[PDB]
Ligand binder design. Structure first.
Ligand SMILES: NC(=O)c1ccc[n+]([C@@H]2O[C@H](COP(=O)([O-])OP(=O)(O)OC[C@H]3O[C@@H](n4cnc5c(N)ncnc54)[C@H](O)[C@@H]3O)[C@@H](O)[C@H]2O)c1
Ligand SMILES: [Cl-]
Ligand code: NA
Ligand SMILES: [Zn+2]
Ligand SMILES: [Zn+2]
Lengths: 310, 314
């Protein structure tokens, strides 16, 4: 079973965490041809360390690697350090830039440690903010798509009060979300996606003017551009039908609830802006087991299978 | 075995619809003792008609019945008529009043037809509004609880714009919703539930990082409920709490927060309880089915399921 069919960047995350170890364990499971499609971004010293502990030194010769987030001192597994935090952001930044320039088609970031990044004096509020910052766009133009249990749901807004989200919603914002999400769908192996747009208000207002001002004009424009788009519709109703390859959530909770319920441990979070698709694996850096050789690479392999489709 | 363990009122709905027919088919499946706990409200003429079509005349002689929503003309199955609309509201009103007075412990309303009611000149926007109107309370003090697939979710607000819902949210509104929902839980066979309150904003505002609403509304409300001795968690992010699945009752601030989980897990299976004062009123999960009324082919499964839910052992 080949799971990688396109070029991918893998940023190895916090070099003191389990990110290095799971990168190797993942790459080990792949064939030689698959390995050559994955470019690893991170400090060599950490990959060396993990390879020694896990006894996978012979794998290192086959890795395609680019030095990023170099360390000035030896790797200290399990230790939260500002240096490690800087490393994480640099590795991820270099992967993103490689996707931006067309060297790879998508990026996977191994687990970061939020405290490490903060201690380096780096502002970080998630991959959507980082991706925007690196690509030099506004946070408004990078969207989060959750993928889990068959469902794909792009969020037009995220991480702000409901009132604040309502004030920012516009037809253009919804259109930009869908364009970004449709291009990502192509990458996930769905060329002609059937799109469903959630209503802002219950039953898509059939209960306020917001949908007539926002979601209705947006769907009209998308359809004129030749997209197959239904809605606005009541979130609850459309989801239940299970007739669509992509759903467009207006609000955080509309999109987050379905995914956490159906896919408690199988959900991917894709950050999407410009040409770039960045997934995390859905777990932390596990400092209590780092350097002890007990980390499993299942979540990383799942992320690779999803982004590596075709 | 027994699915009915307390007294219920059954309002038979639009008498031209399938409501009469499914009431009989349901009662047929129950034992004699169970049948004697269900008091049927509606026009006798419609039950007679349905009994003839379904060949259940001998069942009618056992039925506990109160005349409500009498008709002035023969039943015309399948036909939308104002008279039928008036009938529906009268039957349902009489069942509600029987629950209000303590004659029954809960109410089931069989399917109505919205057009019929409107043509009778009667304002109707759902059972929450009717229940409020009959009990003489405001629509703000009657709440909708969805039940399906182990989930129970009461909605603090319901069928209104998000903006409108946000403007009405207050600590007291949240408290009233929970009180109503807790008393209903007792009736559903879970006394003293473990309650989870959803946040208004994502992540329950994460303190105050994503708006002040939760600090002003859900936090003081939970504090008050806990001081009164209730086991209540939150506010928490809706998505997060639901995923845990370790609470008997959830409190949704907004329509979609509560409706999405239920339709996902229980695509058909979900009951909608209107709760006001001491009265709990469920619908059956379907319409009056005018196209098949009076042909004897309607399924009673949804009614039986509603009876099992409201009829549960204390
Ligand atoms: N309560 C109401 O508001 C109500 C009732 C009847 C009709 N209507 C009007 O007609 C539309 C559709 O309503 P509907 O009556 O078709 O119901 P529905 O949408 O709830 O159910 C779909 C169809 O399934 C069948 N069905 C439903 N319950 C059944 C049962 N117990 N046994 C066998 N078959 C059953 C009927 O043919 C029904 O038409 C509504 O959108 C409305 O405009 C409304
Ligand atoms: Cl490559
Ligand atoms: Na911190
Ligand atoms: Zn979130
Ligand atoms: Zn509804």
């Amino acid at each position: 079973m080949t799971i990688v069919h396109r070029r991918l960047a893998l940023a190895i995350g916090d070099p003191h965490g389990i990110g290095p170890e799971i990168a190797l364990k993942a790459l080990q499971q792949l064939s030689a041809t698959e390995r050559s499609l994955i470019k690893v971004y991170g400090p060599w010293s950490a990959l060396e360390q993990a390879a020694q502990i896990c006894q996978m030194e012979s794998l290192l010769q086959d890795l395609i690697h680019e030095e990023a987030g170099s360390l000035a001192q030896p790797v200290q597994c399990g230790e939260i350090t500002p240096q490690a935090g800087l490393s994480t952001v640099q590795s991820a930044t270099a992967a993103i830039r490689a996707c931006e320039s067309g060297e790879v088609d998508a990026v996977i970031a191994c687990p970061h440690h939020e405290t490490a990044i903060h201690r380096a004096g780096i502002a970080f509020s998630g991959y959507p903010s980082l991706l925007a910052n690196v690509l030099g766009m506004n946070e408004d133009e990078v969207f989060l798509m959750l993928v889990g249990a068959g469902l794909r749901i792009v969020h037009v807004t995220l991480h702000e009060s409901v009132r604040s989200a309502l004030e920012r919603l516009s037809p253009q914002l919804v259109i930009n979300a869908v364009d970004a999400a449709v291009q990502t769908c192509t990458l996930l192996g769905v060329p002609k996606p059937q799109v469903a747009v959630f209503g802002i208000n219950p039953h898509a207002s059939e209960f306020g003017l917001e949908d007539s001002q926002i979601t209705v004009p947006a769907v009209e424009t998308l359809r004129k551009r030749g997209l197959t788009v239904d809605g606005p519709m009541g979130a609850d109703m459309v989801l239940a039908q299970r007739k669509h390859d992509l759903y467009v959530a207006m609000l955080h909770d509309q999109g987050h609830i379905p995914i956490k319920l159906l896919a408690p441990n199988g959900a991917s979070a894709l950050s999407i802006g410009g040409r770039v698709v960045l997934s995390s694996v859905g777990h932390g850096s596990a400092m209590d087991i780092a350097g002890r050789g007990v980390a499993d690479a299942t979540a990383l392999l799942r992320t690779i299978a999803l982004l590596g489709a075709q």
